[PDB]
Ligand binder design. Structure first.
Ligand SMILES: CCCCCCCCCCCCCCCCCC(=O)OC[C@H](COP(=O)([O-])OCC(O)COP(=O)([O-])OC[C@@H](COC(=O)CCCCCCCCCCCCCCCCC)OC(=O)CCCCCCCCCCCCCCCCC)OC(=O)CCCCCCCCCCCCCCCCC
Ligand SMILES: CCCCCCCCCCCCCCCCCC(=O)OC[C@H](COP(=O)([O-])OCC(O)COP(=O)([O-])OC[C@@H](COC(=O)CCCCCCCCCCCCCCCCC)OC(=O)CCCCCCCCCCCCCCCCC)OC(=O)CCCCCCCCCCCCCCCCC
Ligand SMILES: CCCCCCCCCCCCCCCCCC(=O)OC[C@H](COP(=O)([O-])OCC[N+](C)(C)C)OC(=O)CCCCCCCCCCCCCCCCC
Ligand SMILES: CCCCCCCCCCCCCCCCCC(=O)OC[C@H](COP(=O)([O-])OCC[N+](C)(C)C)OC(=O)CCCCCCCCCCCCCCCCC
Ligand code: HEC
Ligand code: HEC
Ligand code: HEC
Ligand code: HEC
Ligand code: HEC
Ligand SMILES: COc1c(O)c(C)c(C/C=C(\C)CC/C=C(\C)CC/C=C(/C)CC/C=C(\C)CC/C=C(\C)CCC=C(C)C)c(O)c1OC
Ligand SMILES: COc1c(O)c(C)c(C/C=C(\C)CC/C=C(\C)CC/C=C(/C)CC/C=C(\C)CC/C=C(\C)CCC=C(C)C)c(O)c1OC
Ligand SMILES: CCCCCCCC1=C(O)C(=O)c2scnc2C1=O
Lengths: 246, 125, 93, 55, 385, 385, 93
C-alpha cells in the first residue's frame, strides 16, 4: 500500500509519562484542559468525562464547581409540569458544542468532529500520533497533490486529506501559570490531558503494578527453590542391576 | 504400519546390492542422530506397546530378556529426568542393538492375520 | 460396583508393568542433601547441552521462513514505491 | 542458619504466624511502595502542583 | 483406609490430584494442562463480576464497558484481566496442543482424549468471539457480521439461518443481547467438557517424553507435581501481570475503542491475533463456499492425525525427519498469521496460498510419508540379512 | 463385555440409568427425584431463551419482560413456563422432602445424601428469589429490600454488608443488575450439587417403603423404572400445561404487574406461596434479631433428624404413633402457610406463635420421645419374661 | 483403580445379601398374559383398601387443623364487625 494511504509514521517523543515508574504530569494536564476549553471545545465534545473527575487531578473542588455552573442542564420539571433549566453540578458530564450529529456536520462542511474522550486509545500511535497531527500541517501541500475543496493536507493522517484545518497558532492562549504558549507547547499539553481523559486510572494502575510484580517475582523465585528441595530425593536417585539366575 | 510390512520393504532393500549400499549408510547415520543409544535403550525398547500384538510378544519373551528390558527402561526415565546422558561407556553398542523382540512380533502378526483370513473364508461349490 | 473395562494402566501394587527382579534403587533424604547452591561449577557447563543438539531442528526451519518473509516484504515495498509502479501494473491484475 | 533455629527451632512456620505476618506485611509494604513511587514522581503530582497554586 | 480414600467425594480428589501415579520423567510441557484450568477459572470469575455492571442493550453496551472502566472500583483490573486473559488462554492452548502433536499424545490409546480436546478448542473459539461482540466496538460489529454471514454459504437455507441468528434485518439489538446470553452459557459447557477430557486422561494416564510405558516407575501427583505446577502458575501470573498493569492494550485493537457503526467498516481490519492464521486461510480461496469449507477443515483435520501417523513408536524425540518437519509446520503456522495481518497484496496472496497448502499437506502427505520412511530406516540399520 | 459397560462415558450412564439395581417394591413416591431433574432442565432452558431478550437495567427490566410477553414469538409461553415452573419445582421438592421424612430416608447410611439435599433446597430458595427480583414489579422491589435487609441483623457490620449487597444507598440499578447476573449463575451450582446428591445415592442405593434391605430382590432401572418414570413425567406436564395456558397468573401476585416504586409499599403484601410458612415464622417473633435467627433455624433443623430419631427401624410404615404425628406436622406446615397470607391480627398472631412452636417441637421433642416409646412397645409386646 | 470404601450395596452377582437357598421363583411372559383389561371385576373391590387403613391417620390431624382454622377465622370476622368493636378494644392492644 502506498505511503500516502498508510500515512506518515509518527516518531517517538519523550513523554514524561512513558516508563513503568512514571505518572502523568498534572501541571501539563491542567494547561491542556485550558487549551481544550479555549480552542477544541468549539467543535469537539468530551462526553465521557465527568466534572468530578477533574477534582484532585488538575483543579480544586472549588474551581471545578465554578466551571460546571457556567453551563445549563435540564432539571426535573416543576410542580406544574413545565420544563426548567438549572446550573451544573459536579455529578454532570462536560457538555458538547452540538445538540446532535446533523448540526455538527452542518457546522463543519459535512464532517463530524469525533468525541475526544478515548481518542488516544482509539488510534495506533497514541500520544505520538495526536501531537504529530496537530503540529504537522505544512503551509503548502507537496507538489502534485490535488487537494479537494474544503480539505487540508497533513502527512500523518491516512490519505493526507483531512477535514480539520490547523487550529493551533503561537500565543493564542494565555497560560494561567505563565508558560510560553507556543504551538508545540500547547499540542504537548492537550494531548497529555487527552491521554488522562482516556486512561484516568493511569497513575494508580502503575503503582498497583509495581506491588504486583514484586510479589509475583518473589513467589516465582521461591517456588523454584521449594520445588528443587522437594525433588532432590528423586533427582539423585541411583539404580543397580544384578541379572537374576535362572 | 505392521512389522510384516516393514520387513518386506526392508529385506528387499537389504538383499539388492544396488539399494543396500545406497541406503544402509544413511540409515546408520539416522540411528546415531536419533540418540536413543545414549540413553541406554535398544530400538526394540521404543516400540509402542499398547496394542494386542505387542502384549502377546512381551508375554512370550523369555525371563532374562524381560528383566533386562525393565532395567533399561527405568534407567532411561531416570537419566531423562536428570537432563543428562549416560557416560559413554554405558551406551548401547551397535552390536548390542539387536531386534530381540522382532521375531515374537512377526510370529504374532502371522497368527493374527491367519485368524482374520480363516474367519472370513468364502466357499465355492 | 459395575465391571470396568481393561486399560493399560492400573494403580499402586498392580500398575500393569512386567515383573521386576534384580533391580535395586537407592536414595538419600532431601533433608541430608547440600542446600540448593551446588547447581553451579558442577551443573553449569553440563547445562545448555540439551539445546546444542536441538537448535538446528529449530533454526533451519526458522531461517527458511524468515528469509521467505523478508523477501516477500521487501518486494511489496518496492512494488508500491515510485520506482516499482511500472512492475506493479504488470504483476497486479 | 542459627537465626532460624532461635525463632522456630527445627520446626516449620505455622499458619497462625503466617497469617499474622501477612497482615503486617500488607501494611508495611504498601507504605514503602507509595513512598518510593511519590518521591520518584516529585514535581509531577497534584500535591506538588497544588502548592504552586494560590487561590 | 485413609479418609481421603474412603469418602465418596474425597476419593475423586485423591485419585485425580493426590495419589495419581505419574511417569517420573514428564517435563514442564506437561504443566500446560493445569495452566488451562487456571485460565478457565480466571475467565469465569472476572466475567461474573463484570456482568454485574454490564448492559447488553445495543444502545448501552459500549458505554457500560466504559462505565466498568471508569466508575467500578478496580473495574479496569477486571476488564484488562478478562481481556488479556483470553489471549493468554490461547497462547497456552496452542502450546498444550503443540506438545501433544510433538509427543504423539494423540495416538492410541488416547484418541478419545485427543478428540474431546478438539471439541474444547472449537468451543473456546466460539466463546471468545461472542465475548468480543459484547464490547460492541467497531471490530465487534463487523466480526459479528462476518462470522454470522459464514452460514450463508450453506446452499438453499443459508441466508435464512443468518436472518434467524441475527433476529432481524442486520446485526442489531436482538443480536448483541443473544450474544451476551450465549457468552455466559458456553463457558460452563467447556467446564463439563474439561471434566470428560480428564476422565479420558485418567483411564490410561499421561504419556511421557520417551514415548514408551511409564508403568515401571511412577511417582505420586501429590507433592512432586503439585509443587512443580506451582512454579509455572506463578510464572504465568507474573507475565500476565506485566500486560495487565503495564501494557493492557497491546493485544487489542484501537478500533474497538470506537462505537460500532452499521454504515462504516474500518479501512484496515485485523482480527484477534489468535484467529489470524484462520483468517489468512479463508482469504486465500477466491470462492465464497470453498473459502469457508477450507477454513473449517483447517480445524477438523486435527482429527486425522491418529490414522496418518504410520510410525511404530510414539513421539518425535528419537526421529530426525519428524522433528525437522514438525518445526516447518510450526513456523508455517506463524507465517500464516503474519500474512493475515497484511493487506491482500501481491507477494502476500501467493505466499498465503502456498502456506495454506503446506498446512494441510503436513497432516495428509508429509506425516504419513515421513513416518513410513523412518520405520524402514530403523529396521535396515540393525538387521543383518 | 457390552460396549455400554466398557466405554468410559457410557458406563456412567449404564451404572446410573440402565443397570442400576433398584428395590423391587419402591412406589410412586420414588418418582419425584426424576421430576426434580426435569424441573431443573425446564428452568434452565426457558431461562436462557428469555435472557436473549431481557435487559437488566432498572429503567428497562420491567418493560423488557413486557416485551417478552408481547413481541417475542411464543414469548408468553416462555415466561409462563418459567414462572409456573418455579412453583411446580417447589411443590415437587416438598413432596420429595416429605417422602424422605416419612420413610426415614435421612437415616444412616444416607446422612450425606440428606445433608446435600438440604444445601440444594437452600440454593433453590435463593435462586427463585433472585429471579423474582428480575421482574422488578412492586413485589420484586420490596422483596429485594426485605431479604437484603435480613443481613442488618448481624451485630456491628450488618448494615455494611447490606449497603455492600445493594451497591449503593438503596435497592437500585446496581442491585437488580447484580441480581440478574447471580440468578443466571446459581442454577449451574445447583446442577453440580445435584450430581453430588446422585453420587451419594449411588453408594448405598435407594431405600424402600418397608424400610428394610433391598439386597435380596432387585430389578434393573432400565425398562421397569424408566417406563414408570414416564407415567409421572406426562402427568406432571399435563397439569403444568393447564396452568400455563388456562390459568397462568393464579400462582402469582397482581402487584407484580405494577412497576417497582421506591416510595410506596403495597397495602397488602403476600409473598410467594412457597415462602409463606417461613414468612409466618419470621412475623411471629416480636424481635428483629431473634426473628431472622428462628426463620433460618426452621431450615437448618432438618439436619437434626438423623440424631433425634431414636427408633430401631427405618420409616413410619409400621408405626402408629409416628404416622399420626407425621401428619400433625404436615398440616401444621400448611397452617403456617395460611397464617402467612393473613394480616397481623388477633386470632392469627397467637395461632402463628403456637404453630411455630409445634414445628420445632416435632424435630426436637415429639420424634425422640415417640420413637423411644414405640421401641419399648415393640419389645414388651412379644417378650415373655 | 484406587481402592473403594465398604458399602451396604454391591452389584449383580455380589449384591451383599445373605446366601439364599430353598426359594424358587416362577414367572410368565407379559406377552402370554391377558391384555390389560382384567384389572376390574377381580381388581376393583380389592383396591381402595390401602386407604381405608390410612385415612384416619390423615383425617383426624386434618380435622383438628381445619376446626382450629375455622374457629380463629370466624372470631376474626366478628372482632372486625360492628358487634365486636367493643371486644376488639379489649383483646387488641
Ligand atoms: C508480543 C509477544 C509476547 C510473547 C508472550 C510470551 C507467552 C507467555 C504465555 C505463557 C507464559 C507461562 C508459560 C510458562 C511455561 C512455558 C515454558 C515451557 O513450557 O518450557 C518448558 C521447557 C522444558 O524444560 P524441561 O525440559 O522440562 O526442563 C529442565 C529444567 O532445567 C529443570 O529444572 P528446574 O525445575 O529444577 O527449574 C527449572 C526452571 C523452571 O523454570 C521455569 O519457570 C519453567 C520453564 C520456563 C523456561 C522459560 C520460558 C520463557 C517464557 C517467557 O527454573 C529455572 O531456574 C529456569 C529459569 C528460566 C528463565 C525463565 C524466564 C524469567 C523471566 C523473568 C521475566 O523449559 C525450557 O527449556 C523453555 C524453552 C523456551 C520455550 C519458549 C516457547 C514459548 C513461546
Ligand atoms: C390451587 C392448588 C392446586 C394444586 C396443584 C396440584 C400439585 C401438582 C404438582 C405435581 C403433579 C405431578 C405429580 C404426580 C405424582 C404425585 C402423586 C404421587 O406421588 O402419588 C403416589 C401414590 C402412591 O401410589 P402407589 O402406592 O405407589 O400406587 C399403587 C398404584 O395403584 C399402582 O398402579 P399403576 O402403576 O399400575 O397405575 C398407577 C396409576 C398411576 O397413576 C399415576 O399417574 C401415578 C400416581 C398418581 C395418583 C394421582 C395424584 C393426584 C394429582 C392431581 O395409574 C392409574 O390408573 C391411577 C389413576 C389416578 C388418577 C390421577 C388423576 C387424573 C387427573 C386428570 C387431570 O399414588 C396415590 O395413591 C396418590 C395419593 C394422592 C396424593 C396427593 C398429594 C399431593 C398434593
Ligand atoms: C498465532 C501466530 C501469531 C501471528 C500474529 C503475528 C502478527 C504481528 C503483526 C505485526 C503487525 O503489523 O500487526 C499490526 C496490527 C495492526 O496494524 P494496523 O491496524 O495499524 O494497519 C493499518 C491501520 N491504521 C491505519 C489505523 C494504522 O497490530 C495488532 O492488532 C496486532 C499486534 C499484536 C500481535 C500479537 C502476537 C502475540 C503472540
Ligand atoms: C406451603 C403451603 C401453602 C400455604 C398457602 C395457602 C395460601 C392460600 C391463601 C388464601 C388467600 O387468601 O390468598 C390470598 C393471596 C392474596 O390476597 P390479597 O392480596 O387479595 O389481600 C389484600 C389485597 N387486595 C386489596 C389487592 C385485594 O392470593 C395469593 O397470592 C395466593 C393464592 C395461591 C396460593 C397457592 C397455593 C398452591 C399450593
Ligand atoms: C472545529 C473548527 C475544530 C477545532 C477547533 C478542532 N477540531 Fe479536531 N477535528 C475537526 C474535524 C472537522 C475533524 C474531522 C477530520 C476528518 O477528516 O474526519 C476533526 C478531527 C480531529 C481528530 C481525529 C483525527 C483522526 O485521526 O481521525 C483529532 C485527534 C482532533 N480533531 C483533535 C483536535 C484537538 C486536540 C483540537 C484542539 C487543539 C482540535 N481537534 C480542534 C474540527 C475541529
Ligand atoms: C458473564 C460471565 C462471563 C463469563 C463466564 C465469561 N465472560 Fe467473557 N466477557 C463477559 C463480559 C461481561 C464481557 C464484556 C466486558 C469486557 O469487554 O471485558 C466479556 C468480554 C469478553 C471478551 C472481550 C474482551 C475485550 O477486548 O474487551 C473476550 C475475548 C472474552 N470475554 C472471552 C472469554 C472467555 C475465553 C471466557 C471463558 C473461557 C469468558 N470470556 C467467560 C462475561 C463473561
Ligand atoms: C438466564 C437464565 C436463567 C436461568 C438459568 C434461570 N432463570 Fe429464572 N429467570 C430468568 C429471567 C430472564 C427471568 C425474568 C423473566 C421472567 O420474569 O420470567 C427469570 C425469572 C425468574 C422468576 C420470576 C418469575 C416471574 O414471576 O416472572 C423466578 C421465580 C425464577 N426465574 C426461577 C428460576 C429457577 C427456580 C431457576 C432454576 C432452577 C431459574 N429461574 C433459572 C432467567 C433464568
Ligand atoms: C487438541 C487437543 C487438546 C486440547 C485443545 C486440550 N487438551 Fe488437554 N490434553 C490433550 C492430550 C492429548 C493430552 C495428553 C497429554 C499426554 O499425556 O501426552 C492432554 C492432557 C491434559 C492434561 C494432563 C497434563 C498435561 O498438560 O499433559 C490436563 C490437565 C489437560 N489436558 C487439561 C486441558 C484443559 C483444561 C484444556 C482446555 C480448556 C485442554 N486440556 C484442552 C489434548 C488437548
Ligand atoms: C432435603 C432433602 C432433599 C432434597 C431437597 C433433595 N433430595 Fe433427592 N433425595 C433425598 C433423599 C434422602 C433421597 C433418598 C430417598 C430414599 O431412597 O429413600 C433422595 C433421592 C433422590 C433420587 C432417587 C429417586 C427418589 O426420588 O427417591 C433422585 C433422582 C433425587 N433424590 C434427585 C433430587 C434432585 C434433582 C433434587 C433437587 C434439585 C433433590 N433430589 C433434592 C433428599 C433430598
Ligand atoms: C494425569 O496427569 C495430570 C492430571 O491428571 C491433573 C489433574 C493435573 C492438575 C490439573 C488440573 C486438575 C486442572 C483442572 C481444572 C478444572 C477442574 C477446572 C474446572 C473449572 C471450573 C471453571 C469450575 C467452575 C467454577 C464455578 C461455578 C465458581 C466460580 C464462581 C464464583 C465463586 C462466584 C462467586 C460470587 C460472589 C457474589 C461472591 C496435572 O498436572 C497432570 O499432569 C501430569
Ligand atoms: C437409585 O435411584 C434412582 C436413580 O438413581 C436415578 C438416576 C433415577 C432417574 C432420574 C435422574 C437421573 C434425574 C437426573 C437429573 C439430572 C442429571 C439433571 C442435570 C441437570 C442439568 C440442568 C444439565 C445442564 C444443561 C445444560 C448446560 C444445557 C441446556 C441448555 C441448552 C441446550 C441451550 C441451547 C442453545 C441454543 C441457541 C440452541 C431414578 O428414578 C431412581 O429411582 C429409584
Ligand atoms: C475459526 C473461526 C475463524 C474466524 C475467522 C473470521 C475472522 C474475521 C474476519 O474474516 C473479518 O472479516 C472480521 S471484520 C472484524 N473481525 C473479523 C474477524 O475476526
Amino acid at each position: 500500500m502506498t505511503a500516502a494511504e498508510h500515512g506518515l509514521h509518527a516518531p517517538a517523543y519523550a513523554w514524561s509519562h512513558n516508563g513503568p515508574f512514571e505518572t502523568f504530569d498534572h501541571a501539563s494536564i491542567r494547561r491542556g484542559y485550558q487549551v481544550y476549553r479555549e480552542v477544541c471545545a468549539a467543535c469537539h465534545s468530551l462526553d465521557r468525562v465527568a466534572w468530578r473527575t477533574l477534582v484532585g487531578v488538575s483543579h480544586t473542588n472549588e474551581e471545578v464547581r465554578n466551571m460546571a455552573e457556567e453551563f445549563e442542564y435540564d432539571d426535573e420539571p416543576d410542580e406544574q409540569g413545565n420544563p426548567k433549566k438549572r446550573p451544573g453540578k459536579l455529578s454532570d458530564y462536560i457538555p458538547g458544542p452540538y445538540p446532535n450529529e446533523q448540526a455538527a456536520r452542518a457546522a463543519n462542511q459535512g464532517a463530524l468532529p469525533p468525541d475526544l474522550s478515548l481518542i488516544v486509545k482509539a488510534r495506533h500511535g497514541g500520544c505520538d500520533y495526536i501531537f504529530s497531527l496537530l503540529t504537522g500541517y505544512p503551509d503548502e501541500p507537496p507538489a502534485g497533490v490535488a487537494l479537494p475543496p474544503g480539505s487540508n493536507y497533513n502527512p500523518y493522517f491516512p490519505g493526507g486529506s483531512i477535514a480539520m484545518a490547523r487550529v493551533l497558532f503561537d500565543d493564542m492562549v494565555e497560560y494561567e501559570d505563565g508558560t510560553p504558549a507556543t504551538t508545540s507547547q500547547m499540542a504537548k499539553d492537550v494531548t497529555t490531558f487527552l491521554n488522562w481523559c482516556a486512561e484516568p486510572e493511569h497513575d494508580e494502575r502503575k503503582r498497583l503494578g509495581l506491588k504486583t510484580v514484586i510479589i509475583l517475582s518473589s513467589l516465582y523465585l521461591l517456588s523454584i527453590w521449594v520445588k528443587k528441595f522437594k525433588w532432590a530425593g528423586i533427582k539423585t536417585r541411583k539404580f543397580v542391576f544384578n541379572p537374576p539366575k535362572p | 504400519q505392521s512389522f510384516t510390512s516393514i520387513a518386506r520393504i526392508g529385506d528387499y532393500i537389504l538383499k539388492s546390492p544396488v539399494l543396500s549400499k545406497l541406503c544402509v549408510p544413511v540409515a546408520n547415520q539416522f540411528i546415531n542422530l536419533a540418540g536413543y543409544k545414549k540413553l541406554g535403550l535398544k530400538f526394540d525398547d521404543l516400540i509402542a506397546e499398547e496394542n494386542p500384538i505387542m502384549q502377546t510378544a512381551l508375554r512370550r519373551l523369555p525371563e532374562d530378556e524381560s528383566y533386562a528390558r525393565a532395567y533399561r527402561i527405568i534407567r532411561a526415565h531416570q537419566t531423562e529426568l536428570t537432563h543428562h546422558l549416560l557416560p559413554r561407556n554405558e551406551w548401547i553398542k551397535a552390536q548390542e542393538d539387536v531386534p530381540y523382540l522382532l521375531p515374537y512380533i512377526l510370529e504374532a502378526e502371522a497368527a493374527a492375520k491367519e485368524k482374520d483370513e480363516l474367519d472370513n473364508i468364502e466357499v465355492s461349490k | 460396583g459395575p465391571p470396568s473395562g481393561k486399560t493399560y494402566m492400573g494403580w499402586w501394587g498392580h500398575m500393569g508393568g512386567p515383573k521386576q527382579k534384580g533391580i535395586t534403587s537407592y536414595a538419600v533424604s532431601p533433608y541430608a542433601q547440600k542446600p540448593l547452591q551446588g547447581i553451579f561449577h558442577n551443573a553449569v557447563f553440563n547445562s545448555f547441552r540439551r539445546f546444542k543438539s536441538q537448535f538446528l531442528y529449530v533454526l533451519i526451519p526458522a531461517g527458511i521462513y524468515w528469509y521467505w518473509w523478508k523477501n516477500g516484504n521487501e518486494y511489496n515495498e518496492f512494488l508500491y514505491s515510485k520506482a516499482g509502479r511500472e512492475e506493479l501494473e504488470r504483476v497486479n491484475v | 542458619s542459627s537465626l532460624y533455629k532461635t525463632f522456630f527451632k527445627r520446626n516449620a512456620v505455622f499458619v497462625g504466624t503466617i497469617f499474622a505476618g501477612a497482615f503486617v506485611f500488607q501494611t508495611v509494604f504498601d507504605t514503602a511502595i507509595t513512598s518510593w513511587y511519590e518521591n520518584h514522581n516529585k514535581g509531577k503530582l497534584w500535591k506538588d502542583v497544588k502548592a504552586r497554586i494560590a487561590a | 483406609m485413609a479418609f481421603r480414600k474412603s469418602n465418596v467425594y474425597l476419593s475423586l480428589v485423591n485419585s485425580y490430584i493426590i495419589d495419581s501415579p505419574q511417569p517420573s520423567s514428564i517435563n514442564y510441557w506437561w504443566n500446560m494442562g493445569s495452566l488451562l484450568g487456571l485460565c478457565l477459572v480466571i475467565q469465569i470469575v472476572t466475567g461474573i463480576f463484570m456482568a454485574m455492571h454490564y448492559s447488553s442493550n445495543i444502545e448501552l453496551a459500549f458505554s457500560s464497558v466504559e462505565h466498568i472502566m471508569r466508575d467500578v472500583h478496580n473495574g479496569y483490573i477486571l476488564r484488562y484481566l478478562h481481556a488479556n486473559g483470553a489471549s493468554f488462554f490461547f497462547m497456552v492452548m496452542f502450546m498444550h496442543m503443540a506438545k501433544g502433536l510433538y509427543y504423539g499424545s494423540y495416538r492410541s490409546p488416547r484418541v478419545t482424549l485427543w478428540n474431546v480436546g478438539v471439541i474444547i478448542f472449537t468451543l473456546t473459539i466460539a466463546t471468545a468471539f461472542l465475548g468480543y461482540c459484547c464490547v460492541y466496538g467497531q471490530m465487534s460489529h463487523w466480526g459479528a457480521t462476518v462470522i454470522t454471514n459464514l452460514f450463508s454459504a450453506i446452499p438453499f437455507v443459508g441466508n435464512d439461518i443468518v436472518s434467524w441468528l441475527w433476529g432481524g434485518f442486520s446485526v442489531s439489538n436482538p443480536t448483541i443481547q443473544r450474544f451476551f446470553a450465549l457468552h455466559y452459557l458456553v463457558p460452563f459447557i467447556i467446564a463439563a467438557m474439561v471434566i470428560m477430557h480428564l476422565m479420558a486422561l485418567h483411564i490410561h494416564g499421561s504419556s511421557n517424553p520417551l514415548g514408551i510405558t511409564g508403568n515401571l516407575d511412577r511417582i505420586p501427583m501429590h507433592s512432586y507435581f503439585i509443587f512443580k505446577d506451582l512454579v509455572t502458575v506463578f510464572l504465568f501470573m507474573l507475565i500476565l501481570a506485566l500486560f495487565v498493569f503495564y501494557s493492557p492494550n497491546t493485544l487489542g485493537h484501537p478500533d474497538n475503542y470506537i462505537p460500532g457503526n452499521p454504515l462504516v467498516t474500518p479501512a484496515s481490519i485485523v482480527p484477534e491475533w489468535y484467529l489470524l492464521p484462520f483468517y489468512a486461510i479463508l482469504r486465500s480461496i477466491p470462492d465464497k463456499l470453498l473459502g469457508v469449507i477450507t477454513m473449517f477443515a483447517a480445524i477438523l483435520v486435527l482429527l486425522v492425525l491418529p490414522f496418518t501417523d504410520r510410525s511404530v513408536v510414539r513421539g518425535n524425540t528419537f526421529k530426525v525427519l519428524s522433528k525437522f518437519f514438525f518445526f516447518i509446520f510450526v513456523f508455517n503456522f506463524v507465517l500464516l498469521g503474519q500474512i493475515g495481518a497484511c493487506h491482500v497484496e501481491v507477494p502476500y496472496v501467493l505466499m498465503g496460498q502456498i502456506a495454506t497448502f503446506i498446512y494441510f499437506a503436513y497432516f495428509l502427505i508429509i506425516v504419513p510419508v515421513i513416518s513410513t520412511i523412518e520405520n524402514v530406516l530403523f529396521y535396515i540399520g540393525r538387521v543383518n540379512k
